[PDB]
Write an enzyme that holds these catalytic residues in place. Structure first.
Site, PDB file in Angstrom:
ATOM      1  N   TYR A  71      44.860  38.124  37.892  1.00 32.69           N
ATOM      2  CA  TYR A  71      46.292  39.768  38.103  1.00 32.69           C
ATOM      3  C   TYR A  71      46.998  39.667  37.566  1.00 32.69           C
ATOM      4  CZ  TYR A  71      43.780  39.253  43.161  1.00 32.69           C
ATOM      5  OH  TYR A  71      42.495  39.710  43.583  1.00 32.69           O
ATOM      6  N   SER A  72      47.561  41.037  36.648  1.00 32.27           N
ATOM      7  CA  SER A  72      48.631  40.535  35.927  1.00 32.27           C
ATOM      8  C   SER A  72      49.925  40.616  36.822  1.00 32.27           C
ATOM      9  CB  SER A  72      48.331  42.479  35.872  1.00 32.27           C
ATOM     10  OG  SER A  72      47.004  43.491  35.667  1.00 32.27           O
ATOM     11  N   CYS A 253      47.554  50.367  31.779  1.00 36.77           N
ATOM     12  CA  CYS A 253      47.013  49.755  32.657  1.00 36.77           C
ATOM     13  C   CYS A 253      46.538  50.254  34.344  1.00 36.77           C
ATOM     14  CB  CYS A 253      47.998  48.325  32.833  1.00 36.77           C
ATOM     15  SG  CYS A 253      47.597  46.841  33.528  1.00 36.77           S
ATOM     16  N   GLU A 293      44.417  47.375  29.305  1.00 36.08           N
ATOM     17  CA  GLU A 293      44.785  46.527  30.053  1.00 36.08           C
ATOM     18  C   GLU A 293      43.991  47.674  31.641  1.00 36.08           C
ATOM     19  OE1 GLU A 293      45.846  42.471  31.813  1.00 36.08           O
ATOM     20  OE2 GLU A 293      46.036  43.385  33.348  1.00 36.08           O
ATOM     21  N   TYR A 295      40.868  47.617  34.580  1.00 37.80           N
ATOM     22  CA  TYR A 295      39.666  46.965  35.402  1.00 37.80           C
ATOM     23  C   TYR A 295      39.298  47.623  36.962  1.00 37.80           C
ATOM     24  CZ  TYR A 295      44.492  46.519  37.824  1.00 37.80           C
ATOM     25  OH  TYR A 295      45.463  46.544  37.877  1.00 37.80           O
TER      26      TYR A 295
HETATM   27  C1  LIG Z   1      42.853  41.716  33.492  1.00 35.77           C
HETATM   28  C2  LIG Z   1      42.609  41.914  34.936  1.00 35.77           C
HETATM   29  C3  LIG Z   1      44.189  42.461  35.838  1.00 35.77           C
HETATM   30  C4  LIG Z   1      44.563  42.304  37.150  1.00 35.77           C
HETATM   31  N1  LIG Z   1      45.386  42.596  37.696  1.00 35.77           N
HETATM   32  C5  LIG Z   1      45.171  43.308  39.236  1.00 35.77           C
HETATM   33  C6  LIG Z   1      46.314  43.560  39.752  1.00 35.77           C
HETATM   34  O1  LIG Z   1      47.587  43.672  39.533  1.00 35.77           O
HETATM   35  N2  LIG Z   1      46.350  43.780  41.050  1.00 35.77           N
HETATM   36  C7  LIG Z   1      45.163  43.979  41.748  1.00 35.77           C
HETATM   37  O2  LIG Z   1      45.425  44.177  42.872  1.00 35.77           O
HETATM   38  N3  LIG Z   1      44.084  43.764  41.012  1.00 35.77           N
HETATM   39  C8  LIG Z   1      44.436  43.464  39.232  1.00 35.77           C
HETATM   40  N4  LIG Z   1      43.175  43.591  39.281  1.00 35.77           N
HETATM   41  C9  LIG Z   1      41.934  43.040  40.376  1.00 35.77           C
HETATM   42  C10 LIG Z   1      41.654  41.411  40.478  1.00 35.77           C
HETATM   43  O3  LIG Z   1      41.222  40.937  39.977  1.00 35.77           O
HETATM   44  C11 LIG Z   1      40.271  42.160  41.938  1.00 35.77           C
HETATM   45  O4  LIG Z   1      39.183  42.000  40.897  1.00 35.77           O
HETATM   46  C12 LIG Z   1      40.505  42.551  42.803  1.00 35.77           C
HETATM   47  O5  LIG Z   1      41.484  42.093  43.203  1.00 35.77           O
HETATM   48  C13 LIG Z   1      39.505  42.430  43.674  1.00 35.77           C
HETATM   49  O6  LIG Z   1      39.172  41.173  44.195  1.00 35.77           O
HETATM   50  P1  LIG Z   1      38.107  40.480  45.474  1.00 35.77           P
HETATM   51  O7  LIG Z   1      38.344  40.133  45.958  1.00 35.77           O
HETATM   52  O8  LIG Z   1      38.972  41.636  46.133  1.00 35.77           O
HETATM   53  O9  LIG Z   1      37.521  41.792  46.155  1.00 35.77           O
HETATM   54  P2  LIG Z   1      35.991  41.000  45.564  1.00 35.77           P
HETATM   55  O10 LIG Z   1      34.954  40.493  46.818  1.00 35.77           O
HETATM   56  O11 LIG Z   1      35.601  40.097  44.557  1.00 35.77           O
HETATM   57  O12 LIG Z   1      34.655  42.137  45.431  1.00 35.77           O
HETATM   58  C14 LIG Z   1      34.593  43.072  44.760  1.00 35.77           C
HETATM   59  C15 LIG Z   1      33.479  43.587  44.221  1.00 35.77           C
HETATM   60  O13 LIG Z   1      33.569  45.413  44.811  1.00 35.77           O
HETATM   61  C16 LIG Z   1      31.755  45.285  45.069  1.00 35.77           C
HETATM   62  N5  LIG Z   1      31.821  46.899  45.274  1.00 35.77           N
HETATM   63  C17 LIG Z   1      31.198  47.437  45.559  1.00 35.77           C
HETATM   64  N6  LIG Z   1      31.357  49.585  46.073  1.00 35.77           N
HETATM   65  C18 LIG Z   1      33.444  49.050  45.719  1.00 35.77           C
HETATM   66  C19 LIG Z   1      33.547  50.287  45.021  1.00 35.77           C
HETATM   67  N7  LIG Z   1      33.497  51.079  45.976  1.00 35.77           N
HETATM   68  N8  LIG Z   1      34.894  49.881  45.029  1.00 35.77           N
HETATM   69  C20 LIG Z   1      35.280  48.356  44.493  1.00 35.77           C
HETATM   70  N9  LIG Z   1      34.621  47.968  44.477  1.00 35.77           N
HETATM   71  C21 LIG Z   1      33.168  47.640  44.791  1.00 35.77           C
HETATM   72  C22 LIG Z   1      32.820  45.407  43.385  1.00 35.77           C
HETATM   73  O14 LIG Z   1      30.586  45.256  43.307  1.00 35.77           O
HETATM   74  C23 LIG Z   1      32.902  44.483  42.946  1.00 35.77           C
HETATM   75  O15 LIG Z   1      32.475  43.098  41.789  1.00 35.77           O
HETATM   76  C24 LIG Z   1      42.749  42.950  37.709  1.00 35.77           C
HETATM   77  C25 LIG Z   1      42.264  42.337  37.501  1.00 35.77           C
HETATM   78  C26 LIG Z   1      41.230  42.155  35.737  1.00 35.77           C
HETATM   79  C27 LIG Z   1      40.489  41.938  34.967  1.00 35.77           C
END
Ligand SMILES: Cc1cc2nc3c(=O)[nH]c(=O)nc-3n(C[C@H](O)[C@H](O)[C@H](O)COP(=O)(O)OP(=O)(O)OC[C@H]3O[C@@H](n4cnc5c(N)ncnc54)[C@H](O)[C@@H]3O)c2cc1C
Length: 295
Positions: A71-72, A253, A293, A295
């Site tokens: 997360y940023s 971003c 950046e 994602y």
């Molecule tokens: C450098 C960087 C900075 C980031 N900064 C932020 C930030 O500031 N704020 C923020 O909220 N997030 C940010 N993110 C994103 C964050 O890291 C997560 O990826 C995000 O919060 C979702 O992860 P989670 O476990 O909720 O979802 P998880 O359970 O991982 O689920 C994600 C999975 O959903 C699946 N998927 C299937 N269909 C879809 C769809 N239609 N849309 C999306 N996903 C789908 C994908 O396979 C994906 O791998 C950043 C990511 C990076 C790499």
């Protein structure tokens, strides 16, 4: 010099949630939360533009422990209270998918974070990243192109530049350049940090310009919903003129997808002066003045 990997996934910092506050106002789409964590009891230090990892609890569908999500960082190095004691994130709850049981998919880490209670202990890693750093030069121009949670690093830059308490804390950084934020979100209630962003523009009209692209409330000249790419097209000549300055940095971003339209707009502007944007941009990236950046 730049702090990195003070804490790693094998031995994360255990931070305590101080506050979890909503950023999407009533009538907006989705949930985005400002979450502030207590850093006391560890040595986690960081700078503007970096990220941290969060390790959510539980196992995945295969029974394997969940891995970190990045997360940023949304706070300056001093934290929101300018006390060097905290760190903040700007987290959107991820959700999706169509009618097939089970129909509702909630992202693991984002659901965990957006629903987290003050007092809860959280596994934090990092900080990480050297691609989104703000120049030390107080006369730099800074172009910020953000969508949704992509506002996070922009908040770190803008707070450092413009908050009273930051200016008092940072005698070596008294910003006197020009900063321009172009911020794309679907609705006015979705304008994250709206009140503070607008306060900054009111106070520093010659040093900060704020431009919104609000998709559900504004149309581009072609009649489509207004997105960041449309505002960049609208201001392409202006932005290109700024980019030509040796001291200008640009930051992009947010969720992947906006880069193509931004490039197309800037390519047409640069081509008028016999410049191939893709080449110029490669040189900018190599020079450390084009920061992305997504994602
Ligand atoms: C450098 C960087 C900075 C980031 N900064 C932020 C930030 O500031 N704020 C923020 O909220 N997030 C940010 N993110 C994103 C964050 O890291 C997560 O990826 C995000 O919060 C979702 O992860 P989670 O476990 O909720 O979802 P998880 O359970 O991982 O689920 C994600 C999975 O959903 C699946 N998927 C299937 N269909 C879809 C769809 N239609 N849309 C999306 N996903 C789908 C994908 O396979 C994906 O791998 C950043 C990511 C990076 C790499």
């Amino acid at each position: 010099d730049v702090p990195v990997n003070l804490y790693r996934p094998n031995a994360p910092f255990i931070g305590k949630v101080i506050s979890n506050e909503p950023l999407v106002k009533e009538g907006g789409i989705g949930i985005v939360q400002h979450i502030k964590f207590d850093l006391t009891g560890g040595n986690l230090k960081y700078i503007e533009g970096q990220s941290i990892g969060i390790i959510p609890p539980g196992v995945d569908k295969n029974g394997k422990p969940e891995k970190l999500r990045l997360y940023s960082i949304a706070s300056t190095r001093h934290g929101d209270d300018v006390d060097d004691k905290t760190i903040s994130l700007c987290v959107r709850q991820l959700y999706f998918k169509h009618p097939e049981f089970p129909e509702t998919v909630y992202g693991v880490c984002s659901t965990y974070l957006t629903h987290i209670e003050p007092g809860s202990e959280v596994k934090i890693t990092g900080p990480v990243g050297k691609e989104m750093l703000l120049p030390d030069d107080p006369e730099a121009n800074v172009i910020m192109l953000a969508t949704g949670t992509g506002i996070a690093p922009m908040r770190t830059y803008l707070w450092r530049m413009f908050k009273d308490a930051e200016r008092a804390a940072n005698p070596e950084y008294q910003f006197k350049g020009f900063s321009w934020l172009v911020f794309g979100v679907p609705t006015t209630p979705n304008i994250l940090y709206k009140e503070e962003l607008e306060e900054i523009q009111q106070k520093y009209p010659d040093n900060f310009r704020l431009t919104y692209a609000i998709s559900r409330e504004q149309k581009n000249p072609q009649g489509g919903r207004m997105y960041i790419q449309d505002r960049v097209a609208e201001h392409a000549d202006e932005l290109w003129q700024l980019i030509k300055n040796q001291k200008t940095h640009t930051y992009i971003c947010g969720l992947r997808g906006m880069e193509e339209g931004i490039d197309a707009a800037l390519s047409a502007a640069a081509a008028k002066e016999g410049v191939t944007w893709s080449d110029y941009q490669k040189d900018l990236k190599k020079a450390g003045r084009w920061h992305v950046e997504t994602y």
